Subunit: 197 residues, 4 copies
């Protein structure tokens, strides 16, 4: 089964998450895992002057999403929605839509926020778009036991893994957060191989 982790990250928090998802997915015997990022939409100079992080994952084309059995989408929040970059990219999947190219493919979503607010809404509102493509939607529920832990500030929801970046972007994904992310990749890769070999 082929698994794409398709993400947008400006400052690396979703990048770090995407890597953990990919690691989880790679634990599954029979899973081919690929990590790509969606195109930047900001002018390059503005991206750099805002301190955007350069990334080594290659940029995806809309067209190549058809090659996968499971796509795990990562996006930071922009006010409770997916980022403009992820939105812009999904807006170019109209050809895939008309041909039913993503229909019945597995989809799962992970997110990042500055201070937590909007992390559920970002995921569930991404699910909407996935549903229009007829993708099978995979939440993670409460299998990841870190989800019960209210002793420390922690991303992660039954809807998909999340990370809390701090208001100033200074926080890094915590071990509990990355554990949920790895769980998500492995669970979805498992389902992918179950259905597609």
């Amino acid at each position: 089964a082929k698994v794409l982790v398709l993400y947008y990250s400006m400052y690396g928090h979703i990048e770090t998450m995407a890597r953990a998802v990919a690691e989880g997915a790679s634990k599954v015997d029979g899973a081919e895992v690929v990590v790509k990022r969606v195109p930047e939409t900001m002018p390059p100079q503005l991206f750099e002057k805002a301190g955007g992080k350069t990334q080594t994952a290659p940029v995806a084309t809309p067209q190549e999403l058809a090659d996968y059995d499971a796509i795990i989408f990562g996006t930071p929040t922009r006010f409770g929605n997916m980022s403009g970059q992820m939105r812009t990219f999904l807006d170019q999947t109209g050809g895939l839509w008309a041909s039913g190219a993503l229909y019945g493919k597995l989809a799962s979503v992970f997110s990042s926020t500055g201070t937590g607010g909007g992390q559920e809404q970002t995921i569930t509102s991404t699910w909407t778009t996935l549903a229009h493509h007829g993708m099978v939607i995979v939440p993670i529920g409460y299998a990841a036991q870190e989800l019960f832990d209210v002793s420390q500030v922690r991303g992660g929801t039954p809807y998909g893994a999340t990370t809390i970046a701090g208001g100033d972007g200074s926080r890094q994904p915590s071990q509990e957060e990355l554990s949920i992310a790895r769980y998500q990749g492995e669970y979805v890769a498992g389902l992918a191989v179950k259905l597609n070999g």
Copy 2:
């Protein structure tokens, strides 16, 4: 695979849809299909006086949901949410939740409204609860060609089948609505068999 069509209906619109869903699911050779209803929560005499429809379907218990590989939930809208009767029933699945009894099972949703408004929000707000149980969420996308017909008033969304009951409840599910409902039953059942045998 075992497929439960679990529904709530007061005036029979969801009940009719539920039979169409069961009918589609039954086309799938590996699929054992059962139709049950959630308990009425209204006093029996207020229900009669309101003109409520009597229904032959057996009443489900919360516990028996664990016995199935896929549950397709039918509910009328109450102001853009599932009905209090469906909510009440799902609020009694806390034991199933704690044991992960519905985790990884397939879930799909269909709905009915008086005049169309809230039909999307009912389905996707229902998906939220399904996600807490770690259920795999199954939208229908646009495989059902009737979803492209805008020549007549008709329910059905990429999220799941719907019906339009009319302001006074006098409309009956149309051929196109029932056909989307059958498709949804077949699609979910085929996925249930693909996953579980």
Copy 3:
């Protein structure tokens, strides 16, 4: 202006919150603030054997919601939705709906969850129902500065105040949580008096 804080609470966390909302609302010159709870739907004996908390707020009728200028709804989550009790109560507002009794009234929502997951979805999915009644929806945004604080586990979202009850129900609303709740009551009471005197 008259402000109703209308809540459901089984174990007191939303009750404690509702009291803080009411206190906030009472700081506003010209605001008449009333606190009532919706009816219990569980059999009384089961309510007691589950350790349900007895409450001194009187039970509201659906009919009396028409008397207010602003209604602040409090509910704990049941899997990312409002509780069955709140759902059941709102389902009896069909008379108010047909007469436009809540149309243009202010509405705001606060929630409680065991471990955080579903707290955004509970609020925004309650907003849906409020919208069908034509209520003006009041989120709190980021005016409450505790919302920037990622140093301690903390409820509260830009959508409305929330509290984290702990998996076992043992946590009590924190000062930061109650501060956001008080903010919400006062902000909404302010708007109520601005519009209605």
Copy 4:
């Protein structure tokens, strides 16, 4: 009060709706009404080749949103979300957010879809972003009587006006759709005047 009708349109459906909204808002004597569009993000030549409609409305800047008492946002759907063009624009309101520049301002949303699906989800997913800015969210409920008509295919929801463009974009907003749009403009404008003078 100053009322901004801010929209994105590729094929003119939202543009037509936007003019109807402006028209309704202008009926309110205290209301100064301005119609602006968000920038196109497609290369100018891809836009022409796609058959995009040229539009006379001035292009808004993110900053000038601060100047208004009420903003009514129009966007076509992209798979159940606002369009990438609207998302991109709203992603540039981080300065306004940090200064609380839109806090307490009125917000209301209208949408357009090819065949109806995603019309609710587009509006309410847009409300999420509005809530992060602390905007007061203004749904239309069922004051517009056309919302009770199920005799013809027509957009319009309790969340805000919508139009149905057809699969090929050939439908024009109907009389009933435009009338819901006018109502929404009038209602929001009257609220803007009631709050701000």
